[PDB]
Structures are given as C-alpha cells and as structure tokens.
Write a protein that binds this ligand. Structure first.
Ligand SMILES: CCCCCCCC/C=C\CCCCCCCC(=O)O[C@H](COC(=O)CCCCCCCCCCCCCCCCC)COP(=O)(O)O[C@@H]1[C@H](O)[C@H](O)[C@@H](O)[C@H](O)[C@H]1O
Length: 307
C-alpha cells in the first residue's frame, strides 16, 4: 500500500509508545491487538502507526483499544469519512466556491512545519462575525470541512512530511489566534466546540502534537475551563495558552523562517500581495516528497496559494 512508500518508524527522539520506540510489552500488545482485529475481519488501517495511536489513547489497554477502533471503523462508514476526499473531488468546483466564502472571515491555513517536521496549522478567529458566518455556512458543514481536512492530513500531509523528515510524522502543530474574540461568542459556540472535540477525541486519537493559543483575551484561560471537560487530560497537557511573550515561545518549536512575520518569524508569501487565508504551503507541495498518492487537492480552487 501507499504506507510502504514513506517511513513507518518514528524518530528515536519521539515519545514512548510510538512506532519504532516500543518496550517489549508494548510490542507484544501491538501484536495481540492486531491479531484480535484481524480475527474480527478488519483489514484496513491495521498499520503500526494507526494501531499504536489507538493503543496510546487507551494506555495500552487492549480491550479498550479494540472498542475504540471498532467504534471508529463504524463511524467512518456512517459519516462518510472513507469517501470524503473522493466525494469532494467529484463536486470540487461547487465545494471550492462555497469554501472560499468562509476563508477571509475565518482563516484556516497550513504554513510549513515545526522544528520536528509536523505540519504547522494556523487558524484566526477574531474576524468571525457569527451572524455573517452563518449566512454562508452551517455548523455541520464546518464540522465536515474539518473531517475532510483530517483525511487530507493523513492522506497527503503525513506522507510528504514523513518523507521529508526521514521518519514517521503522525501529529500536527497548531497555532490558534484569538485576537479580538468575544468570550460570550466563545460560550455561544461551545456546542460546536464539543462536536469538534467528540469527533476528534474519539475517532482521531493521538493526532495532536502541540496546540498554542495566542492573543487570547485576558479571561480566556479561565473561560477555557468550560472546554476542558470535552478533552482528555493528555490533550489538555498539549495546549499552551500564551501571553505577551508568545513570539519567542513559538520560536522554541518552529523555525523562524517558517513562521509568518506577524507571529514573530520571517516567512513572507512569494507574492506578498497574496493572502495566508488562501494558502497551503508545505512539504506536500514539494515534488521530492509527493509520492504515489499524488498531490493534495487545492481547497481554495484557483485562489489557492502554494508558494
Ligand atoms: C463556530 C466558529 C467557532 C470555531 C471555534 C472553534 C474552532 C475549533 C478550534 C480548533 C480546531 C483545530 C483542532 C484540530 C485538532 C487536530 C488534532 C486532533 O484531532 O487531536 C485529537 C483531539 O482533537 C480535539 O480534541 C479537538 C478539540 C481541541 C480543543 C479545541 C480548542 C478550542 C478552544 C478555543 C476556541 C474558543 C474561541 C471561540 C471564539 C469564537 C469566535 C466567534 C486527538 O487528541 P490527542 O490528545 O492527540 O489524543 C487523545 C485521544 O484522542 C483520546 O482518546 C485520549 O483519551 C487522549 O489521552 C489522547 O490520546
């Protein structure tokens, strides 16, 4: 499969329980877990990386990991995640036309990688006017956009970033810019955040690498206690709400040349009149690292900025 064509072992510098870094008991658990799933007629998504994500998510409790995996496989079928990329491509023009309507008001863009090679993903929320947004999208449409991205991440971004790094890259580095948000608006969208958290926690285990929140209102750290019940403590431990010294904090994790100027770095788009909210720059655009999966589709259509 495509998995044979990029590295499937993590760096030796990675966390415990990751591919290539297992203890003997963890290796034995992985073999037992795979054996159980094969005996239950599963054939897909049984690679080391996937299965160890599920095992780590349940602290190597095999039966709990089986339940989580069984529930994920059925969810993928019920929701349409297994065909979401193909379905998008079969209606690409109409879907891109609608997606671009959201982009300026709600920037969502990958831009290069962190120091360890993870895809680096930015969102900016301070330009959202909720009344205006809900004229051009629905909550469940935004949720499906996010699932489609999770599938693009796994299908295109992981392979390219892994080939670049020479080791398996399984996780994302997120920077969420909250400059200008209202905490009452945040409260009003808590049900959407819960929907995002439920799908992400239950069906996309161990995909989060690091999650920085910048420019948040003074009261955001305590408002965030309303989100924590939707998240596991492991996930919370990867979320860092940064203060006024955030630029240098990001630079511990991200090469300066990969970070936009406005967030402390030196990265500028090749045409400086282009907009980050139409951009999708990173190793998945480098022909050296694009493999037999082919190149990622361009989610902003003819407006997509790839340099
Ligand atoms: C409607 C518009 C508003 C959108 C405003 C909300 C927009 C949503 C904000 C950010 C979306 C981007 C998040 C993308 C997540 C990608 C990675 C991912 O899927 O990670 C997965 C988890 O992803 C999530 O939980 C997603 C939710 C993250 C918290 C979202 C924070 C949002 C708080 C700031 C928003 C408030 C400002 C709003 C302002 C609104 C202004 C109008 C897997 O986690 P991980 O730790 O790797 O493994 C888990 C495993 O899974 C569990 O089983 C185990 O029990 C546990 O031990 C671990 O093994």
């Amino acid at each position: 499969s495509i998995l044979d064509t990029y590295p499937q072992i993590c760096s030796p510098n990675a966390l415990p329980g990751t591919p290539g870094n297992l203890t003997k008991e963890q290796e034995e658990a992985l073999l037992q877990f795979r054996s159980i799933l094969l005996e239950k007629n599963y054939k897909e998504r049984l690679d080391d990386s996937t299965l160890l994500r599920f095992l780590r998510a349940r602290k190597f409790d095999i039966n709990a990991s089986v339940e989580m995996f069984v529930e994920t496989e059925r969810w993928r079928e019920e929701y349409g995640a297994n065909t979401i990329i193909e379905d998008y491509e079969n209606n690409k023009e109409a879907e891109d036309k609608e997606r671009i309507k959201l982009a300026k008001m709600y920037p969502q863009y990958y831009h290069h990688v962190d120091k360890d090679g993870r895809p680096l993903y930015f969102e900016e929320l301070g330009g959202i006017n909720l009344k205006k947004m809900y004229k051009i999208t629905t909550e469940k449409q935004m949720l499906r956009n996010l699932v489609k991205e999770y599938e693009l991440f796994a299908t295109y971004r992981v392979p390219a970033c892994s080939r670049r790094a020479g080791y398996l890259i399984e996780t994302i580095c997120i920077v969420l810019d909250l400059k200008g948000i209202s905490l009452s608006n945040a409260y009003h969208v808590l049900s959407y955040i819960k929907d995002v958290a439920d799908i992400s926690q239950n069906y996309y285990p161990e995909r989060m690498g690091k999650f920085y929140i910048i420019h948040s209102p003074f009261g955001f750290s305590t408002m965030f206690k309303m989100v924590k019940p939707f998240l596991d403590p492991v996930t919370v431990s990867k979320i860092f709400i940064l203060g006024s010294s955030y630029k240098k904090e990001l630079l511990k994790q991200i090469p300066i040349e990969n970070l936009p100027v406005k967030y402390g770095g030196t990265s500028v788009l090749h045409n400086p009149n282009d907009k980050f909210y139409y951009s999708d720059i990173g190793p998945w655009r480098d022909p050296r690292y694009i493999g037999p999966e082919g190149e990622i589709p361009n989610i902003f259509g003819k407006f997509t900025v790839t340099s």
